[PDB]
Amino acid sequence: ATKAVCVLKGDGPVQGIINFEQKESNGPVKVWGSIKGLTEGLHGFHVHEFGDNTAGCTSAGPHFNPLSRKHGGPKDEERHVGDLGNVTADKDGVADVSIEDSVISLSGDHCIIGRTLVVHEKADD
After folding, report:
1. Backbone interruptions in the chain following residues (C to N > 2.5 Å)
2. Number of structural domains, the chain?
3. Which of 34, 35, 73, 93: disulfide with 69, CB 3.0–4.6 Å?
4. Is 80 marked as a binding-site residue?
């Protein structure tokens, strides 16, 4: 046809359908199932392993420069050993910010306070 029914040559037949039959066959098909199922499950949970395979050959392998950022940029470099919240927040907090508070509380709350509190428990002695 072309104009025997309704400008068949001017209704985006090969052009309008080219993007409509291509976008409606990949968009709501892969963008709403693949990237969240096929590419997310086979390439997002299998290949990518929800990260980088195993952070051994695609994140922490033999290379000091994977992609001038290390996938995303941060992490595994800053929050992995920042030396101010990753090796102290869970360490010093108990091996530097607790021992001193305990070594003084043990003899400062069991000899002066715990003494009377356990001796009479009245208030003082």
Report:
1. none
2. 1
3. 73
4. yes
